[PDB]
Design a protein around this ligand. Sequence first.
Ligand SMILES: *[C@@H]1O[C@H](CO)[C@@H](O)[C@H](O)[C@H]1NC(C)=O
Lengths: 48, 49
Amino acid sequence: SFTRGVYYPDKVFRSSVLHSTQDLFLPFFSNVTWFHAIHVSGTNGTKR
Amino acid sequence: QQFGRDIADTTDAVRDPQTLEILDITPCSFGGVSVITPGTNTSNQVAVL
Ligand SMILES: *[C@@H]1O[C@H](CO)[C@@H](O)[C@H](O)[C@H]1NC(C)=O
């Protein structure tokens, strides 16, 4: 996961300003799972 | 967003909780009081700034 997961941590509006927030965040360039749950593979395919 | 804030983390905009509109908030007029006096030894008339 390259650069995602950033969310507004509060209900306050700000503009033209950089604010530093210490909160639960997804680290940039992190490693997320890649579950498929439907693996259509083979000559005729399947529904794993 | 319920309200707003400024660079110094002080409220600068708020929304009416009943109706959806934006209204900015500023402190009402305040300042220092400066007295212009020529000197008690010279007179007693003064001007306030
Ligand atoms: C709340 O009530 C006022 C008057 O009772 C109304 O004008 C306003 O639209 C209401 N807020 C809503 C519907 O979000």
